[PDB]
Write a protein that binds this DNA or RNA. Structure first.
Ligand SMILES: [Mg+2]
Ligand SMILES: [Mg+2]
Ligand SMILES: [Mg+2]
Ligand SMILES: [Mg+2]
Ligand SMILES: [Mg+2]
Ligand SMILES: [Mg+2]
Ligand SMILES: [Mg+2]
Ligand SMILES: [Mg+2]
Ligand SMILES: [Mg+2]
Ligand SMILES: [Mg+2]
Ligand SMILES: [Mg+2]
Ligand SMILES: [Mg+2]
Ligand SMILES: [Mg+2]
Ligand SMILES: [Mg+2]
Ligand SMILES: [Mg+2]
Ligand SMILES: [Mg+2]
Ligand SMILES: [Mg+2]
Ligand SMILES: [Mg+2]
Ligand SMILES: [Mg+2]
Ligand SMILES: [Mg+2]
Ligand SMILES: [Mg+2]
Ligand SMILES: [Mg+2]
Ligand SMILES: [Mg+2]
Ligand SMILES: [Mg+2]
Ligand SMILES: [Mg+2]
Ligand SMILES: [Mg+2]
Ligand SMILES: [Mg+2]
Ligand SMILES: [Mg+2]
Ligand SMILES: [Mg+2]
Ligand SMILES: [Mg+2]
Ligand SMILES: [Mg+2]
Ligand SMILES: [Mg+2]
Ligand SMILES: [Mg+2]
Ligand SMILES: [Mg+2]
Ligand SMILES: [Mg+2]
Ligand SMILES: [Mg+2]
Ligand SMILES: [Mg+2]
Ligand SMILES: [Mg+2]
Ligand SMILES: [Mg+2]
Ligand SMILES: [Mg+2]
Ligand SMILES: [Mg+2]
Ligand SMILES: [Mg+2]
Ligand SMILES: [Mg+2]
Ligand SMILES: [Mg+2]
Ligand SMILES: [Mg+2]
Ligand SMILES: [Mg+2]
Ligand SMILES: [Mg+2]
Ligand SMILES: [Mg+2]
Ligand SMILES: [Mg+2]
Ligand SMILES: [Mg+2]
Ligand SMILES: [Mg+2]
Ligand SMILES: [Mg+2]
Ligand SMILES: [Mg+2]
Ligand SMILES: [Mg+2]
Ligand SMILES: [Mg+2]
Ligand SMILES: [Mg+2]
Ligand SMILES: [Mg+2]
Ligand SMILES: [Mg+2]
Ligand SMILES: [Mg+2]
Ligand SMILES: [Mg+2]
Ligand SMILES: [Mg+2]
Ligand SMILES: [Mg+2]
Ligand SMILES: [Mg+2]
Ligand SMILES: [Mg+2]
Ligand SMILES: [Mg+2]
Ligand SMILES: [Mg+2]
Ligand SMILES: [Mg+2]
Ligand SMILES: [Mg+2]
Ligand SMILES: [Mg+2]
Ligand SMILES: [Mg+2]
Ligand SMILES: [Mg+2]
Ligand SMILES: [Mg+2]
Ligand SMILES: [Mg+2]
Ligand SMILES: [Mg+2]
Ligand SMILES: [Mg+2]
Ligand SMILES: [Mg+2]
Ligand SMILES: [Mg+2]
Ligand SMILES: [Mg+2]
Ligand SMILES: [Mg+2]
Ligand SMILES: [Mg+2]
Ligand SMILES: [Mg+2]
Ligand SMILES: [Mg+2]
Ligand SMILES: [Mg+2]
Ligand SMILES: [Mg+2]
Ligand SMILES: [Mg+2]
Ligand SMILES: [Mg+2]
Ligand SMILES: [Mg+2]
Ligand SMILES: [Mg+2]
Ligand SMILES: [Mg+2]
Ligand SMILES: [Mg+2]
Ligand SMILES: [Mg+2]
Ligand SMILES: [Mg+2]
Ligand SMILES: [Mg+2]
Ligand SMILES: [Mg+2]
Ligand SMILES: [Mg+2]
Ligand SMILES: [Mg+2]
Ligand SMILES: [Mg+2]
Ligand SMILES: [Mg+2]
Ligand SMILES: [Mg+2]
Ligand SMILES: [Mg+2]
Ligand SMILES: [Mg+2]
Ligand SMILES: [Mg+2]
Lengths: 10, 46
RNA sequence: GGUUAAGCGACUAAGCGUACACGGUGGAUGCCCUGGCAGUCAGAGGCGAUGAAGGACGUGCUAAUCUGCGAUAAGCGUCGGUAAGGUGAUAUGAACCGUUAUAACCGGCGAUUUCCGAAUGGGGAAACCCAGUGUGUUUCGACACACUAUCAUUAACUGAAUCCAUAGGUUAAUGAGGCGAACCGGGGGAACUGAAACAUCUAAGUACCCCGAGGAAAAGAAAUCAACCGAGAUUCCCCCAGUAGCGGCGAGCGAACGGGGAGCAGCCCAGAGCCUGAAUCAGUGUGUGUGUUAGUGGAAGCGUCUGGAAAGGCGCGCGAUACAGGGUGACAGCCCCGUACACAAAAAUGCACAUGCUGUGAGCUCGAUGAGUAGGGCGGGACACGUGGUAUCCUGUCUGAAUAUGGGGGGACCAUCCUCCAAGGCUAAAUACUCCUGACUGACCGAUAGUGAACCAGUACCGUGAGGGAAAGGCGAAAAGAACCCCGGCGAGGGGAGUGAAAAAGAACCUGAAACCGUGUACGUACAAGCAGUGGGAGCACGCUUAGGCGUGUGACUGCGUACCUUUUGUAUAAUGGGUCAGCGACUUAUAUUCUGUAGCAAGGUUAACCGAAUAGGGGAGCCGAAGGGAAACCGAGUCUUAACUGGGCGUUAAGUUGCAGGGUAUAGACCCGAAACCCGGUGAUCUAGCCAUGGGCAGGUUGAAGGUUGGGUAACACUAACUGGAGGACCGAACCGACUAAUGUUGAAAAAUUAGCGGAUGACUUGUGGCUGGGGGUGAAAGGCCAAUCAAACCGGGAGAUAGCU
RNA sequence: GUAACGGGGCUAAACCAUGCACCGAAGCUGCGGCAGCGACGCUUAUGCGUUGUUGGGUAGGGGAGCGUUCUGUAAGCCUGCGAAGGUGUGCUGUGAGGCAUGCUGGAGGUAUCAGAAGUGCGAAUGCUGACAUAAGUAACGAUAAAGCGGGUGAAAAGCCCGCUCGCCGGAAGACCAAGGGUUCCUGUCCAACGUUAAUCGGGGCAGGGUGAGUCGACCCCUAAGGCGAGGCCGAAAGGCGUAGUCGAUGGGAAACAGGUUAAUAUUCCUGUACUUGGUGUUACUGCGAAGGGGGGACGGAGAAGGCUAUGUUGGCCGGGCGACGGUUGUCCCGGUUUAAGCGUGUAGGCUGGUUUUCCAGGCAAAUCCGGAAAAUCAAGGCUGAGGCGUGAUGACGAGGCACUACGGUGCUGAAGCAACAAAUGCCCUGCUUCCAGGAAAAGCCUCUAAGCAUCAGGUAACAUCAAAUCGUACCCCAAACCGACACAGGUGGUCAGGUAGAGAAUACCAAGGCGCUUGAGAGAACUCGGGUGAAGGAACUAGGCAAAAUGGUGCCGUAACUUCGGGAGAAGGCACGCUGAUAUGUAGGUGAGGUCCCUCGCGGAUGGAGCUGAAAUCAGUCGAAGAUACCAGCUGGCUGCAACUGUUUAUUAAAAACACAGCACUGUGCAAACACGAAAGUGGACGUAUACGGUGUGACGCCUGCCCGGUGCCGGAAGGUUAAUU
RNA sequence: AAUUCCUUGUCGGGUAAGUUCCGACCUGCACGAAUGGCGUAAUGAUGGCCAGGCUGUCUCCACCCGAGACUCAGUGAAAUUGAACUCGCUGUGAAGAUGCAGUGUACCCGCGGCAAGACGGAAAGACCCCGUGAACCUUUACUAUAGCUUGACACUGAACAU
RNA sequence: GUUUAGAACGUCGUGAGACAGUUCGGUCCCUAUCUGCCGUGGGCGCUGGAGAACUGAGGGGGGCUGCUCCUAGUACGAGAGGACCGGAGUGGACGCAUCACUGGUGUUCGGGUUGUCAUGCCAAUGGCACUGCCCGGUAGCUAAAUGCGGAAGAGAUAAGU
């Protein structure tokens, strides 16, 4: 599994 | 780092042993399902 | 000719490209089936305290496992069958046993049948621990059998408060316990979904849970239907009919009457006699008949050819109530096993008939005629029928009759008339299903298929657990499975030799593809820009031809030329998809309906269930069509509208119907794959959270509370001084515990750590071993935290192929 | 990057106006071929010099075919003179294709016309298997460290032996539990497994190995808790629970030392013990409970005292006279060990003791316990370390000589003492103190009921039997357990050497165990872990992040503020080595001999030998530096928030969040409210308003004002309105 | 001011220079008294600010010690990948070109390096929107319901007083 | 900083919550295949082979500037003031080279010293403790140390004469 990387913008 | 599995023969037999399973009908239904499936090892007891 | 100059100039291939040749890897294709799949016809539908199902451990000439079996341990007795061979398999070998009937094998009937498991002497973490009683043994240490669970029923004996009693208690007899596929009855009972949302409704009384029973179950002998004629228990099939109806009158749900079939069976109590053991049923013996559980016989071919081998070819025969199949060195009627037919049972057992006992009562007369019931009020449920005008059925609640001179029903209700007699019971057949047995069948599969499993598969493996769950078949006719020689490490591997038809079948073994990776040859390639090809094309190489030149490979050079799919107004697009190959992978099926095509019959067409030696025939029950109009009654080639139409609406000349194929539609998963979720039943607090019980741990070094003593002070205190004391969620700081900062690591050493520092460190501390709390629930000094690497509702299985107007 | 002719270039090769050419498309026309369609000529289901015309194409509609598997045709036909399959080649049709052949293979295949479909694959981040790419790149798992000689072997950086070096040593050593399950030992082998090689291995293979009256388990006993006759409750299932019955992590009988195996030992052997039952004998005899009582039996903290483990020194015994100056010396090295048990009952702890008497109590009884009185004794009893004696003329023991397979085996074997220091162990389940007020049961002791009191039974002494069964190897902070790994992780208990140090910190070492399963070179950038740094010193940066710095003991000294405790280790400063002296080894501690005393012993008082041993001062002395290393606070000032210790998002948030003591409101009279449960019941609580629940606030200090309209809650009930029912 | 939008309010202190900090002002956009107000010693891996010390934090890096990186031998991955004979520029173009046009440049091939681009790799986008999606949660959304409460009847009978 | 989940204030909302209002805390992965770029090689070619030294097509680097002095207190200006042009000197920044000097480093040199271990012991040494902690320091490397550089001059020009 993984943990949705939070390098996303807004 | 401590994991989810800490072996304990006394705890293992008291939780899933043949006499613990057969004490209730629901556990006895597990044995019926495993007998129907043809499991080589019915319970966890040695 | 030499020397210069200018111009041109092949030959190089580190490597690479293309073509071809030869290999490697790999296991696709084809061929094969002692495995599956779907059925047909039968049988058998249970096992178990006389200890089951399912296991554990043992048991051999046995090291393991499989298959048997249980300390009498791949078996023992007996009765049959059968027998010249035989000691199950991997799996040889060893040591043996038999050969005409005590080898072995098969069947019937017994004996033995460890331990666990309803498990039953008690306990227990299943295959273990611990007894009691009694009988009998003695070597005086013990030993061997038997009995000792619970519940229900019955009978004895005893036996409280409490005098009898009763409760209770102790024995003794019986019975029940558990397991197992589906089918059946009953007690409970969803949600997803559909309604393009969603409440009624649908899904659905489905899934699931629980109880009970049988080979079937259930139902069943009219207080039933009909309609003024009648039918005559129940169950099942085809119609009636998608009709009448039900329904946010939406989605959808959906009869009955009646008809055709399958199969038919009726009785008993609510009571006493006269008769009398009548009929009938159940037990049992006693035979017969027919099965079942081992078996017996079972016809008929030679020659030659090819070939390793003949069953094939070519000749000439023979059997057939046997040309069903299988095997045999390639395709066998006559080689083998069988098959068709004809036979067989010591013993056990089924079925049927007969018969004997043990119960069982037949017939006749006179009576009797199911009451907290019917009905009603209230609340629900079941009837297709959702309260509606709603009959009828069941009742949680509250009432409550008549009772044969009487009641029930005839879909509100009343009258009339028909029909039946509830409130007590029993009942075969036609019907449903297949864990299991036997035989047989398939326009069913052929190793990624078919059961998950053709193989020691519910195994290996994964998960705490419930549970999930694989991969993996083929040498050859016969192992003849390669003696021997050689290299090598007394290897591996290989070369010979040998076996065999073939080793181009060598156990990494039938056939052996593609991607991919190599060796060789031909050509091209080191001044040359891009979907890599195409059109043109020299040169070289090579195969034919005879010089006509064609053919093949390569290809300098040159014109043109920005992959494919999907999705889009539009993609070279820097939008999605794809590393490649091979295999697999998506518009089907059932029913109904409409249309087209086609075939048949034709104003008719055609049957369904069912019968049936049965794809025939029977069965026309029904269905469609030939007549429509109107809401309907009704009328009718007309009819409706209206008072009426000269009218107007709909009809009237026009062939349909049954198959087959196809195009649509409808219900089912409905072209395939994919949700996040909802519901149901289980598994998890060996992790973590809290709690409970019982144990353990906290080096060392400081600070010095209260209190106490002795002084000083006071009338006594207070107060004060000194000394003792050792208080604290006190201090510093290891173990221990925490995890604040930074660096590293980030396809880790590690799916959260390491290094250097950091906080707590006698406490609301920390820790070991057990225990308890379970999923809309737990637990939480509270973050939606934690509850087995998963948490704004765990995991597993089921509803389930939920749904997905989206991709 | 010229970038505004596509470029070159052009003064016409531009533009304007006339022309005549030419180039230019799959358009058009030619010359062939295919197909659709329309009306014809004859003939027409067919077809004919037909003719005219049409033929780009997604969604989609219509039409016609190919090929695959299976059924009939087909007991036919094709086929060991080579079928299918595969792999080449050639031919052929508009196409899907077809035909034939060479090679491979070695047994099937199938015309034709129909019939039926699991009937045609490139894609679905499709599924399964195989194989690429990156790529011979990253990595080969803690920077604790290796080196050499020899040996074995086909082969040695990795194995064995030897000699060095390095690492751990409160562990990286030793022993266990839990857990694993043979990994243990020996032989053999190197395919696979080991991140390399491997002769080696926790790998493969074959043998061997686990010995118990005392250790555990089992057993007796109970905790939480589980189950639970009857019972209560619940649609069914079932739930709860009494009597009971299970359930250790707790309570209960007993063994020590020495020796020995390749691998086991409190288990075997040697030596010396102990315990509980059974039986028998003998003697004396009140026994006896499903009963009573006692006992078992229990906290935290703190304070010492007495001890031992253990260590040090001396003595003794044995050995040494030193690879290089010195070393016959106050020198160097080693050894100097002995248990349980038995006897003694010590330091010390606890308690008054002994009779008689009475008594509605201890569910009945009791001789016991608990009570009441009286008498008399100045003691008695209980517990308990340790020491000593015995065990032990033994064992062990440096070493010795002989043999031998480097092992070994056999024999012999000296001293085997004292002082001092000293635990976290023992006395101690004690003592003292505190509040938060600290299991049970059985074994055990005692008491009597019923039932026996000739008996039985009890007590005592001997003899004797019996003590079963199961576990026992090995790993056990790790390569054997939990983490997919021979995984820088996790994992409970026991043991605790020397020097320095307060210490279990830390450094260096002992015993003991290891160098971490790829190496060898090179000595770039860059990255990681570190060292040092001219000058400046926060100019860096969101920010003194990080690093640097501070760091010990003694002494001096120490502010605002304060709840008077603190703040505070505030800050700040001084002294630290070595040698000598005071005092050759002091003060102190320990304490023998000796000498007195004893109702006599493990005695008391003297006595001071001998050991141990700070601290201070003075003098001297070395260095740049004496808390010299390791180890080891940066400090101060202002301010926001929270009182504080604590708790929290396991895995990006430790906070001002939560908790918190305190405060207030409110509910709750006990069959309590409330909560878990269809219910029974349970919790609340075996508590009772000085109690409990809920809510908000959040130490302490000073305080907490106004609004009852709205919304809740509480009280009232006259009137209005109003259900079932009638 | 954890509360002040305007706003870096104004004044004072601190600095050479202070949108932060500290002290006041009140103009409280939009504090306020147990959803407590104001103060408060001590405590804090608490937030902000300042000073001393201290330093490679920096001016401005230099050198050195180790472990990698590099070479050799042995063993030997991974994510990714339509196929590639995979240049620059300008322009064009599903509108930011290695692949189109034009033009320029460039012998064939490794090794050590740096990451500008390949709209690089990772993961059917979490933001936005949509679906007559899902889930939790809130409430005076709707419809119900457990529970609580009211009355009638039943269990449940007989005197008396108003 | 903004931009998740924690928490708080003000504000809005009955409330869950919300706020380009504010406050505190809060995971930044990739071993380089291709293009590109910086270096460094291999292969072949350049017409016999080979060893050297060159030509320069082409490309890159470099191109900054202050202040004093002289001209000159002159031109200009009533004065206050104060040059153009031209020539010197001395700096800043930047770049290159170098290590003589000034320094850094110099865990490979020498010494001092703490704790402990060992060499039998003493003495003298060695190991370990960050190189134990320190004091110095050769060569090399190195800057802060010291040398040098930017030009002048031509050609063709821009604006302008
Ligand atoms: Mg076949
Ligand atoms: Mg719907
Ligand atoms: Mg039966
Ligand atoms: Mg026969
Ligand atoms: Mg009746
Ligand atoms: Mg009624
Ligand atoms: Mg009703
Ligand atoms: Mg109505
Ligand atoms: Mg209606
Ligand atoms: Mg009705
Ligand atoms: Mg296979
Ligand atoms: Mg093969
Ligand atoms: Mg060329
Ligand atoms: Mg071309
Ligand atoms: Mg496609
Ligand atoms: Mg693309
Ligand atoms: Mg892709
Ligand atoms: Mg038709
Ligand atoms: Mg018919
Ligand atoms: Mg008819
Ligand atoms: Mg008309
Ligand atoms: Mg159709
Ligand atoms: Mg469909
Ligand atoms: Mg504390
Ligand atoms: Mg501390
Ligand atoms: Mg503290
Ligand atoms: Mg979790
Ligand atoms: Mg849910
Ligand atoms: Mg599930
Ligand atoms: Mg469903
Ligand atoms: Mg689906
Ligand atoms: Mg044309
Ligand atoms: Mg056209
Ligand atoms: Mg076939
Ligand atoms: Mg075939
Ligand atoms: Mg061929
Ligand atoms: Mg063959
Ligand atoms: Mg298919
Ligand atoms: Mg390599
Ligand atoms: Mg690479
Ligand atoms: Mg490397
Ligand atoms: Mg390693
Ligand atoms: Mg060696
Ligand atoms: Mg060391
Ligand atoms: Mg093994
Ligand atoms: Mg071993
Ligand atoms: Mg090898
Ligand atoms: Mg082994
Ligand atoms: Mg023994
Ligand atoms: Mg034993
Ligand atoms: Mg013991
Ligand atoms: Mg119970
Ligand atoms: Mg019971
Ligand atoms: Mg225990
Ligand atoms: Mg106490
Ligand atoms: Mg001692
Ligand atoms: Mg000498
Ligand atoms: Mg004493
Ligand atoms: Mg052992
Ligand atoms: Mg051992
Ligand atoms: Mg892991
Ligand atoms: Mg592991
Ligand atoms: Mg631990
Ligand atoms: Mg280095
Ligand atoms: Mg440093
Ligand atoms: Mg400096
Ligand atoms: Mg300095
Ligand atoms: Mg600054
Ligand atoms: Mg810091
Ligand atoms: Mg202070
Ligand atoms: Mg502030
Ligand atoms: Mg966290
Ligand atoms: Mg925590
Ligand atoms: Mg944190
Ligand atoms: Mg608060
Ligand atoms: Mg009011
Ligand atoms: Mg109010
Ligand atoms: Mg502001
Ligand atoms: Mg200011
Ligand atoms: Mg202020
Ligand atoms: Mg406020
Ligand atoms: Mg308030
Ligand atoms: Mg602060
Ligand atoms: Mg400072
Ligand atoms: Mg790969
Ligand atoms: Mg490219
Ligand atoms: Mg462009
Ligand atoms: Mg490279
Ligand atoms: Mg980079
Ligand atoms: Mg999404
Ligand atoms: Mg919408
Ligand atoms: Mg922030
Ligand atoms: Mg970080
Ligand atoms: Mg980064
Ligand atoms: Mg020099
Ligand atoms: Mg140095
Ligand atoms: Mg020595
Ligand atoms: Mg060192
Ligand atoms: Mg120097
Ligand atoms: Mg000039
Ligand atoms: Mg000039
Ligand atoms: Mg000019």
């Amino acid at each position: 599994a993984a943990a949705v990387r939070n390098a996303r913008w807004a | 780092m401590k994991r989810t599995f800490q072996p304990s023969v006394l705890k293992r037999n008291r939780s899933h042993g043949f006499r613990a399973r057969m004490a209730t009908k629901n556990g006895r239904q597990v044995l019926a399902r495993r007998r129907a499936k043809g499991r080589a090892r019915l319970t966890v007891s040695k």
